[PDB]
CSV table of C-alpha atoms in Angstrom, one decimal:
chain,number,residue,atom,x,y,z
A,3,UNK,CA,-20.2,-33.4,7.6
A,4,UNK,CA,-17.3,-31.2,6.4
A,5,UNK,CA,-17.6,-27.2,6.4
A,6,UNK,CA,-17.1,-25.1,2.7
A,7,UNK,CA,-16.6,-21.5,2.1
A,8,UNK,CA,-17.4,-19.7,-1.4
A,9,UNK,CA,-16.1,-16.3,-2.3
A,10,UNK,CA,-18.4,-14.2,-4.4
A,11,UNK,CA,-16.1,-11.7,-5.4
A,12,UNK,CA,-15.5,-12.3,-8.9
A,13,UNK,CA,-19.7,-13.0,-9.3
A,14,UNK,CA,-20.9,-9.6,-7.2
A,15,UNK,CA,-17.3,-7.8,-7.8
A,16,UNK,CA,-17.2,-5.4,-10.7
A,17,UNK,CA,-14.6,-4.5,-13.5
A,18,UNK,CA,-15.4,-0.7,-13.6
A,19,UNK,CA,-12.8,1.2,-16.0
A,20,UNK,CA,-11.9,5.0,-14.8
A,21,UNK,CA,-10.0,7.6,-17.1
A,22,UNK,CA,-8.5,10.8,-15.1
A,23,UNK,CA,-5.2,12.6,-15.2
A,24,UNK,CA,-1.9,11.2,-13.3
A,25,UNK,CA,-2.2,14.1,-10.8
A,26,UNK,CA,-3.7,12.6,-8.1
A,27,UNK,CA,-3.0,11.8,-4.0
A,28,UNK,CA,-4.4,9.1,-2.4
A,29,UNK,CA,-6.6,11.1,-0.9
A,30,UNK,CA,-8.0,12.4,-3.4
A,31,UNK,CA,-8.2,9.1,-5.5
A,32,UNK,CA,-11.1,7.1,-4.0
A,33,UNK,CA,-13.9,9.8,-4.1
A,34,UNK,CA,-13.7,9.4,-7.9
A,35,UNK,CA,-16.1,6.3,-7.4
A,36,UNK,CA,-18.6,8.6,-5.6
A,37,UNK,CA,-19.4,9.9,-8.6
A,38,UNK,CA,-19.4,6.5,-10.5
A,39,UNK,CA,-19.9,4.0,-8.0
A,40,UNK,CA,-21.6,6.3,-5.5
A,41,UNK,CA,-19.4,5.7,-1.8
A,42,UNK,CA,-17.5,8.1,0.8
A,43,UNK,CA,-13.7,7.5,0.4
A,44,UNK,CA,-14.2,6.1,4.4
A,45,UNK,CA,-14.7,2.6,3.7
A,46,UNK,CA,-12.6,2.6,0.3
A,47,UNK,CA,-9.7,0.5,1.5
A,48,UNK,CA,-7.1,0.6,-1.8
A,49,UNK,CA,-4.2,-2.6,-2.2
A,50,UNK,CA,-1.9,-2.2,-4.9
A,51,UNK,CA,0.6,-5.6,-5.7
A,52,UNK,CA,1.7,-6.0,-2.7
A,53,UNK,CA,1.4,-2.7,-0.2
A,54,UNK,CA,-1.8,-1.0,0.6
A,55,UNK,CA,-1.2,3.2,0.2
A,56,UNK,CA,-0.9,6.0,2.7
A,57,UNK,CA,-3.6,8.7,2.5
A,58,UNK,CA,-2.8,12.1,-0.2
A,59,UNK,CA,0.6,10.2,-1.7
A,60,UNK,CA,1.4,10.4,-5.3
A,61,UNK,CA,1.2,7.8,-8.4
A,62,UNK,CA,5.1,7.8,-8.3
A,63,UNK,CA,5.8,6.3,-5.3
A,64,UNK,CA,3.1,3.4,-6.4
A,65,UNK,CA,4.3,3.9,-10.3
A,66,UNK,CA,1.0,3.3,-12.2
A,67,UNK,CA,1.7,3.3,-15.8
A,68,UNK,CA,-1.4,3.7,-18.4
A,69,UNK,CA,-3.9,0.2,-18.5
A,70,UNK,CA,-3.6,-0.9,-15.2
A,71,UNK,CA,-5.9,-2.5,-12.3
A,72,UNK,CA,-6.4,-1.7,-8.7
A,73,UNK,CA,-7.3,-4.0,-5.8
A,74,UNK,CA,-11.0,-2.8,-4.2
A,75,UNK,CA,-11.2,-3.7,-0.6
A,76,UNK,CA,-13.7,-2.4,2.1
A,77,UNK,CA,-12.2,-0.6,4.8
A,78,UNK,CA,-13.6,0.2,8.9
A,79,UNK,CA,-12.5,4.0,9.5
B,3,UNK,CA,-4.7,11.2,-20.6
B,4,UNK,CA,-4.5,7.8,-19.8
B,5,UNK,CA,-6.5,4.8,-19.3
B,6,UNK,CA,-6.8,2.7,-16.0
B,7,UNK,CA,-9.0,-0.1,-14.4
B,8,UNK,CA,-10.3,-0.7,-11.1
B,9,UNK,CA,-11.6,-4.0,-10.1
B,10,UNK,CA,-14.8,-4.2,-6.9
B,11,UNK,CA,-14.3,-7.6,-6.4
B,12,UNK,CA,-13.2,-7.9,-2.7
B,13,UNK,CA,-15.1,-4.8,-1.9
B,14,UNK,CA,-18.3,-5.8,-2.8
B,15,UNK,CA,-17.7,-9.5,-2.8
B,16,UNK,CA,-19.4,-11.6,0.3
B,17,UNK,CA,-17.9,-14.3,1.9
B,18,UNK,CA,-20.4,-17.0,2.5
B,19,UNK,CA,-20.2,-20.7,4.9
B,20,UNK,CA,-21.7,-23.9,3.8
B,21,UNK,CA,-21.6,-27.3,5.9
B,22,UNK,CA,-22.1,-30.7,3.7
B,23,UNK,CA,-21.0,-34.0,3.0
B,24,UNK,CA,-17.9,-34.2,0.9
B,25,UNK,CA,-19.1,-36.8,-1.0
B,26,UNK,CA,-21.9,-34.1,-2.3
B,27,UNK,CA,-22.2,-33.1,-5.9
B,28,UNK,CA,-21.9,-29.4,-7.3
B,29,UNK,CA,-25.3,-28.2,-7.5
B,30,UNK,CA,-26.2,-29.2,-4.1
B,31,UNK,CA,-23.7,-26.1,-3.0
B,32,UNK,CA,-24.8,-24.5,-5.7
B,33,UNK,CA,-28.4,-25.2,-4.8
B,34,UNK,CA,-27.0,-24.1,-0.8
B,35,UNK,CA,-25.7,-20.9,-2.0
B,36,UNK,CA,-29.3,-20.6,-3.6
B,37,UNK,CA,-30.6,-21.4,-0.2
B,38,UNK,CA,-27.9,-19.3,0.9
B,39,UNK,CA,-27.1,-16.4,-1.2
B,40,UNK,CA,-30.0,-16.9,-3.8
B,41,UNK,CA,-28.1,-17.0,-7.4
B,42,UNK,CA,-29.6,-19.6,-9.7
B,43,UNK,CA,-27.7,-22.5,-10.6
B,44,UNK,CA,-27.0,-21.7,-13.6
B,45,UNK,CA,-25.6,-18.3,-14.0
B,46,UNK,CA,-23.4,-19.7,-11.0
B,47,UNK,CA,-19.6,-20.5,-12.8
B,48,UNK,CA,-17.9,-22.5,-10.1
B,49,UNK,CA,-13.9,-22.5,-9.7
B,50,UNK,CA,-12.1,-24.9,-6.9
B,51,UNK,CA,-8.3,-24.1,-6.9
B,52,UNK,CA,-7.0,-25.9,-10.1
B,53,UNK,CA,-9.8,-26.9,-12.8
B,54,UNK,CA,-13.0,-25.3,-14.0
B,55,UNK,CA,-15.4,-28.3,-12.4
B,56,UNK,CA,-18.8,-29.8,-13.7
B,57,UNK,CA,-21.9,-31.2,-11.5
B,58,UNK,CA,-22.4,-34.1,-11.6
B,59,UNK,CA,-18.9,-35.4,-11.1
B,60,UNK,CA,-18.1,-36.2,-6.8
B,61,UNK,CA,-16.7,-34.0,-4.6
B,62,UNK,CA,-14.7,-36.5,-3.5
B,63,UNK,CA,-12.8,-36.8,-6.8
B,64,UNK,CA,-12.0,-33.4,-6.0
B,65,UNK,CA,-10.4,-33.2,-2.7
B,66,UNK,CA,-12.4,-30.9,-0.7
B,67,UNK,CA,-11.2,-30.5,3.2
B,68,UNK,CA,-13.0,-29.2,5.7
B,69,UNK,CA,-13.1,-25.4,5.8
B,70,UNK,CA,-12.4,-25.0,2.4
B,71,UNK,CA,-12.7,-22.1,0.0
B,72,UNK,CA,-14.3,-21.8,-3.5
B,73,UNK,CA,-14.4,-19.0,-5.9
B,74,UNK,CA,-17.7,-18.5,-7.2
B,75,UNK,CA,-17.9,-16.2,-10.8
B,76,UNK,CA,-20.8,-15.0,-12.9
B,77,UNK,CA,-22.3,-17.3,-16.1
B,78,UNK,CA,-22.9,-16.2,-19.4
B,79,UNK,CA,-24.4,-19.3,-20.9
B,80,UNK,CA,-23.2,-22.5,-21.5
Protein backbone atom coordinates (compact mmCIF):
# COMPACT_ATOMS: atom_id res chain seq x y z
CA UNK A 1 0.00 0.00 0.00
CA UNK A 2 1.51 3.53 -0.36
CA UNK A 3 -0.75 6.75 -0.04
CA UNK A 4 -0.71 9.54 -3.35
CA UNK A 5 -2.06 12.95 -3.56
CA UNK A 6 -3.05 14.78 -6.97
CA UNK A 7 -3.49 18.50 -7.23
CA UNK A 8 -6.09 19.60 -9.69
CA UNK A 9 -5.30 23.09 -9.92
CA UNK A 10 -3.80 23.53 -13.20
CA UNK A 11 -6.97 21.01 -14.64
CA UNK A 12 -10.08 22.91 -12.62
CA UNK A 13 -7.79 26.34 -12.20
CA UNK A 14 -8.52 29.00 -14.79
CA UNK A 15 -6.24 31.48 -16.74
CA UNK A 16 -8.84 34.40 -16.80
CA UNK A 17 -7.19 37.75 -18.26
CA UNK A 18 -8.48 41.18 -16.60
CA UNK A 19 -7.80 44.78 -18.17
CA UNK A 20 -8.52 47.90 -15.63
CA UNK A 21 -6.64 50.96 -14.76
CA UNK A 22 -3.47 51.04 -12.25
CA UNK A 23 -5.58 52.85 -9.61
CA UNK A 24 -6.57 50.33 -7.49
CA UNK A 25 -6.31 49.18 -3.48
CA UNK A 26 -6.41 45.94 -2.43
CA UNK A 27 -9.58 46.32 -1.42
CA UNK A 28 -10.96 47.21 -4.09
CA UNK A 29 -9.05 44.70 -6.37
CA UNK A 30 -10.79 41.29 -5.87
CA UNK A 31 -14.47 42.32 -6.34
CA UNK A 32 -13.46 42.85 -10.03
CA UNK A 33 -13.99 38.91 -10.41
CA UNK A 34 -17.57 39.40 -9.07
CA UNK A 35 -18.40 40.66 -12.13
CA UNK A 36 -16.38 38.15 -14.16
CA UNK A 37 -15.98 35.24 -12.09
CA UNK A 38 -18.94 35.93 -9.89
CA UNK A 39 -17.44 35.77 -5.88
CA UNK A 40 -17.50 38.25 -2.70
CA UNK A 41 -13.96 39.63 -2.17
CA UNK A 42 -14.31 37.42 1.42
CA UNK A 43 -12.89 34.34 0.41
CA UNK A 44 -10.57 35.91 -2.36
CA UNK A 45 -7.25 35.24 -0.69
CA UNK A 46 -4.52 37.23 -3.25
CA UNK A 47 -0.36 35.88 -3.16
CA UNK A 48 1.89 37.92 -5.18
CA UNK A 49 5.78 36.28 -5.60
CA UNK A 50 6.42 35.83 -2.47
CA UNK A 51 4.08 38.06 0.17
CA UNK A 52 0.40 37.87 0.24
CA UNK A 53 -1.18 41.84 0.31
CA UNK A 54 -2.77 43.94 3.08
CA UNK A 55 -6.35 45.06 2.46
CA UNK A 56 -6.96 48.88 0.32
CA UNK A 57 -2.82 49.10 -0.48
CA UNK A 58 -1.62 50.37 -3.70
CA UNK A 59 0.06 48.64 -7.03
CA UNK A 60 3.32 50.49 -5.93
CA UNK A 61 4.13 48.89 -2.99
CA UNK A 62 3.53 45.36 -4.97
CA UNK A 63 4.97 47.08 -8.35
CA UNK A 64 2.76 45.38 -11.08
CA UNK A 65 4.01 46.39 -14.42
CA UNK A 66 1.65 45.81 -17.58
CA UNK A 67 1.32 41.65 -18.63
CA UNK A 68 1.59 40.13 -15.41
CA UNK A 69 -0.11 37.17 -13.28
CA UNK A 70 -1.57 36.86 -9.88
CA UNK A 71 -1.59 33.95 -7.52
CA UNK A 72 -5.66 32.96 -6.76
CA UNK A 73 -5.97 31.39 -3.39
CA UNK A 74 -9.25 30.75 -1.30
CA UNK A 75 -9.39 32.53 1.77
CA UNK A 76 -11.66 31.76 5.45
CA UNK A 77 -12.71 35.44 6.62
CA UNK B 1 -4.58 51.05 -20.01
CA UNK B 2 -2.82 48.07 -19.38
CA UNK B 3 -3.10 44.46 -19.70
CA UNK B 4 -2.82 41.86 -16.70
CA UNK B 5 -3.57 38.14 -15.94
CA UNK B 6 -4.97 36.36 -13.07
CA UNK B 7 -4.51 32.70 -12.73
CA UNK B 8 -7.76 30.43 -10.41
CA UNK B 9 -5.60 27.63 -10.06
CA UNK B 10 -5.23 27.23 -6.30
CA UNK B 11 -8.50 28.86 -5.69
CA UNK B 12 -10.58 26.55 -7.46
CA UNK B 13 -8.18 23.75 -7.62
CA UNK B 14 -9.13 20.52 -5.21
CA UNK B 15 -6.71 18.56 -3.50
CA UNK B 16 -7.58 14.95 -3.72
CA UNK B 17 -5.97 11.48 -1.62
CA UNK B 18 -5.47 8.22 -3.38
CA UNK B 19 -4.00 4.89 -1.59
CA UNK B 20 -2.32 2.17 -4.09
CA UNK B 21 0.38 -0.07 -4.76
CA UNK B 22 3.50 1.66 -6.04
CA UNK B 23 4.17 -0.76 -8.38
CA UNK B 24 0.59 0.53 -10.12
CA UNK B 25 0.49 1.94 -13.57
CA UNK B 26 -0.90 5.49 -14.52
CA UNK B 27 -4.34 4.89 -15.51
CA UNK B 28 -5.14 3.01 -12.52
CA UNK B 29 -4.85 6.60 -10.62
CA UNK B 30 -6.15 7.98 -13.33
CA UNK B 31 -8.94 5.56 -13.39
CA UNK B 32 -9.06 6.36 -9.09
CA UNK B 33 -9.29 9.95 -9.71
CA UNK B 34 -12.28 8.81 -12.13
CA UNK B 35 -13.51 6.90 -9.15
CA UNK B 36 -12.47 9.74 -7.25
CA UNK B 37 -12.87 13.02 -8.93
CA UNK B 38 -14.70 11.69 -12.20
CA UNK B 39 -12.36 13.17 -15.16
CA UNK B 40 -11.91 10.74 -18.00
CA UNK B 41 -8.67 9.28 -18.63
CA UNK B 42 -7.97 10.90 -21.29
CA UNK B 43 -8.48 14.53 -21.01
CA UNK B 44 -6.40 13.79 -17.68
CA UNK B 45 -2.47 15.27 -18.57
CA UNK B 46 -0.52 13.82 -15.69
CA UNK B 47 2.80 15.71 -14.32
CA UNK B 48 5.02 13.86 -11.39
CA UNK B 49 7.87 16.37 -10.42
CA UNK B 50 10.41 16.04 -13.37
CA UNK B 51 9.03 14.45 -16.68
CA UNK B 52 5.70 14.49 -18.51
CA UNK B 53 4.91 10.47 -17.79
CA UNK B 54 2.99 7.84 -19.97
CA UNK B 55 0.71 4.74 -18.74
CA UNK B 56 1.79 1.96 -19.20
CA UNK B 57 5.30 2.48 -17.99
CA UNK B 58 5.67 1.35 -13.69
CA UNK B 59 5.32 3.50 -11.01
CA UNK B 60 8.13 2.07 -9.64
CA UNK B 61 10.40 3.33 -12.38
CA UNK B 62 9.29 6.47 -11.13
CA UNK B 63 9.97 6.74 -7.56
CA UNK B 64 6.80 7.42 -5.97
CA UNK B 65 6.86 7.54 -1.89
CA UNK B 66 4.24 7.40 0.16
CA UNK B 67 2.29 10.55 0.64
CA UNK B 68 3.21 11.87 -2.50
CA UNK B 69 1.91 14.74 -4.70
CA UNK B 70 1.07 14.86 -8.41
CA UNK B 71 -0.08 17.68 -10.49
CA UNK B 72 -2.90 16.84 -12.53
CA UNK B 73 -3.61 19.35 -15.87
CA UNK B 74 -6.26 19.41 -18.56
CA UNK B 75 -5.81 17.33 -22.21
CA UNK B 76 -6.26 18.67 -25.47
CA UNK B 77 -5.72 15.59 -27.53
CA UNK B 78 -3.03 13.47 -28.08
Amino acid sequence: GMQIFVSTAWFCGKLITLEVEPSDTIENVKAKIQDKEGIPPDQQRLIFAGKQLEDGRTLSDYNIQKESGLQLHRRLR
